[PDB]
Amino acid sequence: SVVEEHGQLSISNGELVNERGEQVQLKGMSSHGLQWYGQFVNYESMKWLRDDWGINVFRAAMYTSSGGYIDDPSVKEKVKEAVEAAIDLDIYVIIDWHILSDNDPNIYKEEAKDFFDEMSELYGDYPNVIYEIANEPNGSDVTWGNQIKPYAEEVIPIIRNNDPNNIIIVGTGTWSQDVHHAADNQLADPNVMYAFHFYAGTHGQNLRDQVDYALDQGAAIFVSEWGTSAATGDGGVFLDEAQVWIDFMDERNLSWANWSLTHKDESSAALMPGANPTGGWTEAELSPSGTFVREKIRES
Ligand SMILES: OC[C@H]1CNC[C@@H](O)[C@@H]1O[C@@H]1O[C@H](CO)[C@@H](O)[C@H](O)[C@H]1O
Numbered sequence: 001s002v003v004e005e006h007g008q009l010s011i012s013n014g015e016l017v018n019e020r021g022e023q024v025q026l027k028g029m030s031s032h033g034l035q036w037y038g039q040f041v042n043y044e045s046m047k048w049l050r051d052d053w054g055i056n057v058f059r060a061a062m063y064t065s066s067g068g069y070i071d072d073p074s075v076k077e078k079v080k081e082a083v084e085a086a087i088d089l090d091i092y093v094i095i096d097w098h099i100l101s102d103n104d105p106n107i108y109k110e111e112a113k114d115f116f117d118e119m120s121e122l123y124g125d126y127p128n129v130i131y132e133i134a135n136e137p138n139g140s141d142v143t144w145g146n147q148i149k150p151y152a153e154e155v156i157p158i159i160r161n162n163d164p165n166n167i168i169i170v171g172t173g174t175w176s177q178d179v180h181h182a183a184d185n186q187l188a189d190p191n192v193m194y195a196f197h198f199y200a201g202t203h204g205q206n207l208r209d210q211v212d213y214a215l216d217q218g219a220a221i222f223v224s225e226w227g228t229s230a231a232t233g234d235g236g237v238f239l240d241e242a243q244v245w246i247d248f249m250d251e252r253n254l255s256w257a258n259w260s261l262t263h264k265d266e267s268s269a270a271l272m273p274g275a276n277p278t279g280g281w282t283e284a285e286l287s288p289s290g291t292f293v294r295e296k297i298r299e300s
Contacts, residue, residue, distance in 0.1 A: 002056045003090040008127045009167050011191050014218045015253055016167070019127075026092055026255035027297050028057035029270065030225055031082070032262040033098070035067045038078045039277040040261050043085040048279025049261075050089050054297045058086055059094040059224065059257040061135070065102040070111060079119070086128050094169070094224060094257065095119055096132040104142045105134035105151040105171070112151075113158045124163030131159055132224055134171035136197065144173050144181040156189055169222045171195045175231075177207065179221060183214035193220040198245060199268075200238035201230030208248050215252065223249060223256035228289040229268035233259065237267045237288050246296055258293045270294075 007019035018024045029049055031041050041060065049055045060082040064070050079095055086093035097112055099105055105112070116131060123129045133155050137148050152170045159168060168191065172178045176195040183194070196211055198204060214221055228242045229235055249256055263271040270290030275281050286294060 001090055003092065003128055008165070009092070009130075010165060011167070011193065011220045014215060014220045016193070016220060016222070016255055023253050025250070025253055025300075026057040027300055028055035028059065028091070028257050029053075029261045029293070030059035030096070030257045030259050031061045032260040032264065032269070033061055033063045033066065033068060034075045034078045035063055035072065037260075037262040037264065038075070040271070041078060041082050042278060043088060044278040045261075046082070046085045046091070047089055048281070050091055052279075053294045054300065055091065057092040057094060057130075057255070057257060058082060059096055059132070061096045061098045061260070063098045063100065064108050064111075066100065068098065069115070070102075070108055076115065076118075080122070083119075083123055083129065087126055091128065092130060093128050094130045094132050096135055096224070098135040099171070100136055100138075103137065103139045104147055105137055106147055109151055109154060112155055116155055117158050117162065120159045120162035124159075124166065127166070129163070130167045130169060132169040132171070132195065135195075135225070136175040137171045137173055138175045142173060144178065145185055148173060148182075149185060149187065152187055156187070156192070160189070165191050167191055167193060167222075169193050169195050169224050176225070179214035179219065180210050183217040183219035186217070186219055193222040195224045196221050197223065197225045199227045199229055199231040200242040200245060201235055204241055204245060208245075211248075211252070211254075221254055223254050225259050226256055227259040227268035228292060229266065233268045234266040237292075239288075239292055242292065
């Protein structure tokens with residue numbers, strides 16, 4: 001129903017819109033690393049998230065390093081499983097080239113080009129797909145102008161040769177927080193968005209103001225990852241600040257995916273240890289984070 005109703009997504013005047021030019025907001029879940037917790041990514045679990053939580057997007061977090069795709073490329077097949085499930089379930093899907101320790105996206109740019117060529121050739125005639133080409137550029141030696149933007153200007157043409165206008169999300173500096181610099185030096189492609197990531201354990205008032213600055217430059221922003229925890233993915237749950245961010249994102253038409261769908265013993269994880277990897281969770285099988293996130297999506 002979601003993808004049939006909204007169809008082809010695009011950017012108009014800095015906003016995500018549907019094929020009738022109306023604003024749309026996506027809200028959903030990210031997987032954890034597919035090399036560690038891929039059992040939670042399947043048609044049945046995604047269907048349960050769609051029907052019981054109300055998700056309309058799912059993010060497939062394919063780590064490049066840390067045992068991910070560069071080390072063992074078989075994980076790309078789990079991305080394909082996720083995309084095919086989203087197509088069958090009529091929801092949107094984010095294909096996330098999940099850089100982190102490999103902090104400069106140029107480190108694995110050759111492999112990224114080949115991966116996004118393959119994915120856009122396979123899936124480029126479906127409206128479901130959103131390409132996230134570099135999760136979290138980071139380090140003082142990785143800047144928008146010097147590293148990230150030129151990386152994007154090599155990968156985006158590869159995608160566009162197969163898929164002329166599905167959305168592309170481009171990571172920003174400082175773990176996808178530096179939307180100010182991106183917004184002052186935007187890419188040419190009209191269907192690009194810049195990633196912004198937050199964790200509720202960080203006091204967020206200036207970060208909200210920086211998102212507003214970026215929006216005021218006409219840049220589109222997708223909150224492609226956020227958590228209720230501290231910035232480590234652990235360290236407690238911060239639901240007061242999470243709610244402030246939820247309300248901010250609703251006021252600003254910002255789409256989002258929450259980190260993450262796993263039973264790992266960390267506060268950002270949505271599930272508790274006994275949760276079935278094919279869905280059907282009871283209240284007791286959701287963590288405090290998962291309960292909150294489910295409520296936010298159901299309220300929506
Ligand atoms: O630190 C929380 C997030 C921030 N965004 C990137 C994402 O990969 C990260 O998740 C954590 O990553 C570390 C390192 O891979 C894992 O050990 C954590 O379990 C995970 O939450």
